């Protein structure tokens, strides 16, 4: 039942910008999200001090997907464990305890990809989190779909637009509510030529060219969040990427880099069936 939103697809109602995504299938400079627009959006919350760590996504009633560098990053002495964090699902407001709406969960086990490369370019920047107990779905909480080989092949193309959501910085003040922005996928060559960092096949970049007029990007605080696309075949939302890294925020000639979810799906399946 993944990827079908209670307040939209199931009622045959469209959100205000999804048409832009479908029309292309031939957070800085984002807008406030509509209620229930991204029911799979998760907030990684640190207990002490109470603070926003990263974004993440709900892929089932028991698992949450996020970026490995949100939990483990030796250069900044970051190394969190199960009890250092809380997962908050179904939110809209960044700072308020949305009573009766959001659900806060504890973590049972964190899984970081064995070959996550924090030393050089954040290659394989992905991690799974097993919640202590299943989250009940609702109008504001619903999992997103993971792509199958076919869906990934036909949607992950230069020019095609995806959607990124997060409570991160609005500029390189934080927002009051979840922000959203739609960005086009950029050709590998252009991605490579925009940075000194060695780019691997487990990443793709997104953003507008300096001449396209439109702009927008993810920023600090958004890492670990989902880059989603709506399939025009079955109308479901699929998570194609994970906000990984960027050089600054919304700089011209620069683009955001995302973890290529499908390329690492084997590991995801492996961990899920072997541990629950």
């Amino acid at each position: 039942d993944c990827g079908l939103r209670p307040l939209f697809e199931k009622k045959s109602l469209e959100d205000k910008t999804e048409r832009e995504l479908l029309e292309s299938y031939i957070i800085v400079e984002g807008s406030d999200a509509e209620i229930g627009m991204s029911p799979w959006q998760v907030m990684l919350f640190r207990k002490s001090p109470q603070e926003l760590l990263c974004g993440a996504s709900l892929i089932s009633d028991r698992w949450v997907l996020t970026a490995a560098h949100c939990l483990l990053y030796p250069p900044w002495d970051k190394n969190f464990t199960e009890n250092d964090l809380l997962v908050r699902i179904g939110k809209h407001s960044r700072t308020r305890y949305e009573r009766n709406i959001e659900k806060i969960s504890m973590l049972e086990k964190i899984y970081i990809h064995p070959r996550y490369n924090w030393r050089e370019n954040l290659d394989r920047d992905i991690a799974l989190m097993k919640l202590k107990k299943p989250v009940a779905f609702s109008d504001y909480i619903h999992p997103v779909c993971l792509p199958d080989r076919e869906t990934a092949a036909s949607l992950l193309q230069a020019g095609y637009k995806g959607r990124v959501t997060g409570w991160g910085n609005l500029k390189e003040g934080q927002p009051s509510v979840l922000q959203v922005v739609n960005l086009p996928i950029v050709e590998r060559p252009v991605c490579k030529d925009s940075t000194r960092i060695r780019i691997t096949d487990n990443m793709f970049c997104a953003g507008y060219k300096p001449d396209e007029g439109k702009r927008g990007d993810a920023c600090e605080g958004d890492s670990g969040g989902p880059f989603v696309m709506k399939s025009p075949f079955n109308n479901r939302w699929y998570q194609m990427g994970i906000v990984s890294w960027g050089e600054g925020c919304d700089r011209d000639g620069k683009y955001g880099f995302y973890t290529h979810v499908f390329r690492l799906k084997k590991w995801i399946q492996k961990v899920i069936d072997q541990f629950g």
């Binding site: 207990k47 109470q50 603070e51 809380l86 700072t95 308020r96 305890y97 806060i104 504890m106």
Partner: peptide
């Protein structure tokens, strides 16, 4: 500026 979450979760 985060709002106090219930101690039941902490």
């Amino acid at each position: 500026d985060f709002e106090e979450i219930p101690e039941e979760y902490l």
